[PDB]
Amino acid sequence: SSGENLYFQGHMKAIVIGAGIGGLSAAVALKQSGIDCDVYEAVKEIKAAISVWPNGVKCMAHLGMGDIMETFGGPLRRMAYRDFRSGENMTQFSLAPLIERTGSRPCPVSRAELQREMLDYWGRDSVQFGKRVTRCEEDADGVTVWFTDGSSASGDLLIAADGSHSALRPWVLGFTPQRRYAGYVNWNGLVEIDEALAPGDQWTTFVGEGKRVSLMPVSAGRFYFFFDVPLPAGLAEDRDTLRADLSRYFAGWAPPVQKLIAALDPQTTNRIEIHDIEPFSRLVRGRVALLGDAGHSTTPDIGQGGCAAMEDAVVLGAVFRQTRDIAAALREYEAQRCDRVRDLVLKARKRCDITHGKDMQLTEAWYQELREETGERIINGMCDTILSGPLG
Numbered sequence: 001s002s003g004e005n006l007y008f009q010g011h012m013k014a015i016v017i018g019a020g021i022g023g024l025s026a027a028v029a030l031k032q033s034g035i036d037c038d039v040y041e042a043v044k045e046i047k048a049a050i051s052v053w054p055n056g057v058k059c060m061a062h063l064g065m066g067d068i069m070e071t072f073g074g075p076l077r078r079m080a081y082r083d084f085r086s087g088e089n090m091t092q093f094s095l096a097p098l099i100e101r102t103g104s105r106p107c108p109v110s111r112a113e114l115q116r117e118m119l120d121y122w123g124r125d126s127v128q129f130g131k132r133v134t135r136c137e138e139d140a141d142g143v144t145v146w147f148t149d150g151s152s153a154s155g156d157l158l159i160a161a162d163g164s165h166s167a168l169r170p171w172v173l174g175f176t177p178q179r180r181y182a183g184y185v186n187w188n189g190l191v192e193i194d195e196a197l198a199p200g201d202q203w204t205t206f207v208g209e210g211k212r213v214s215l216m217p218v219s220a221g222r223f224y225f226f227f228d229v230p231l232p233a234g235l236a237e238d239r240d241t242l243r244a245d246l247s248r249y250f251a252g253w254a255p256p257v258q259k260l261i262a263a264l265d266p267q268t269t270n271r272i273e274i275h276d277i278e279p280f281s282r283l284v285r286g287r288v289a290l291l292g293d294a295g296h297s298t299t300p301d302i303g304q305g306g307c308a309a310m311e312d313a314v315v316l317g318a319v320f321r322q323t324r325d326i327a328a329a330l331r332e333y334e335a336q337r338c339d340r341v342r343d344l345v346l347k348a349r350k351r352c353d354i355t356h357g358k359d360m361q362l363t364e365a366w367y368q369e370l371r372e373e374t375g376e377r378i379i380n381g382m383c384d385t386i387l388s389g390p391l392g
């Protein structure tokens with residue numbers, strides 16, 4: 001009863017929903033803090049890239065997963081912005097000074113490699129697949145979830161890391177937030193490095209017309225690429241119309257861009273309409289905490305979605321290091337994370353509005369600053385976002 005010692009192996013069970021970046025990061029952090037986690041994942045089977053900035057990397061290191069970053073992080077050393085017409089350097093500079101101020105190297109990684117490695121680290125045997133949560137209920141003694149397959153599971157703690165379309169989120173919040181279309185469409189994929197495009201150690205972005213085309217190296221001699229185009233949502237466009245779409249959206253753009261359109265494979269290339277969600281002023285309820293996209297859904301414009309989920313997990317584990325008061329721990333988790341992820345969502349949104357011609361004049365002013373940019377201002381801005389993470 002009331003005299004049970006909750007530190008003993010088996011006395012504290014956390015249920016983690018979602019086996020993506022957040023779910024697996026979370027389970028690893030809790031396990032570090034001596035908590036047993038069962039991880040549940042909706043799909044029976046798994047399935048372009050993210051850049052894990054130094055804040056995410058340090059978190060990965062903290063969680064005992066640093067070897068994955070080191071091994072699979074692409075060689076990112078410098079970045080450039082290029083005029084869309086001439087394909088010429090508006091600005092160019094190295095990221096070394098960023099590695100020095102933040103303590104880590106930035107690590108672009110394929111989403112598929114990152115997914116597999118994290119699974120390998122946690123162990124697939126400890127993940128139950130085909131388990132799609134529909135509902136959680138809590139009472140005095142604990143929390144319970146139900147799955148579509150008719151099964152259920154009970155624990156002391158519930159981690160909702162069930163993604164941008166989180167099914168548990170509404171129970172935590174008391175209402176159902178809706179995705180806001182961000183006003184642009186992203187095409188993304190991988191191609192083999194080919195300097196007829198850009199330097200293999202550089203993050204190169206062509207900007208103009210409220211659009212951009214980006215390349216950055218992941219592992220195994222490869223480029224993560226993407227095109228952004230501001231567009232109404234719902235255009236009749238898929239993998240079969242793809243190369244034609246890109247060809248017209250980027251007509252006139254510098255040869256490297258055209259060579260990219262030719263090089264890519266539409267069947268492996270993704271077309272996603274970008275959304276985010278207005279920040280919540282709550283992340284926890286009783287024994288239940290939102291983690292990752294479930295707790296904050298951002299446009300990918302500053303590359304902090306995945307990083308933020310890793311940050312969440314570090315804080316989660318930290319607040320359970322030396323207490324077994326679940327309600328207090330989750331309150332402190334919320335306390336530490338809520339303003340962070342709100343700022344990250346809003347910063348991403350503003351960057352997005354500037355990048356994609358919400359106000360074409362502000363976007364042109366930004367191009368202007370890119371022509372007059374040494375690298376100091378951008379690096380400062382990046383360090384601000386990174387150093388505001390939990391591991392500073």
Ligand SMILES: Cc1cc2nc3c(=O)[nH]c(=O)nc-3n(C[C@H](O)[C@H](O)[C@H](O)COP(=O)(O)OP(=O)(O)OC[C@H]3O[C@@H](n4cnc5c(N)ncnc54)[C@H](O)[C@@H]3O)c2cc1C
Nearest residue numbers: 018020021022042050051133163292293300303305306307
């Ligand atoms: C185009 C693009 C570029 C991006 N670039 C970056 C970047 O450069 N850097 C960065 O840090 N982030 C980036 N992100 C964001 C990053 O991909 C996400 O923030 C990250 O994957 C979120 O992790 P998650 O585990 O919370 O969500 P998810 O990866 O979506 O995981 C949710 C998991 O839960 C499962 N699930 C869903 N519903 C249920 C349910 N009801 N029951 C059980 N399981 C369920 C899903 O199958 C999934 O496995 C980018 C995102 C996009 C779209």
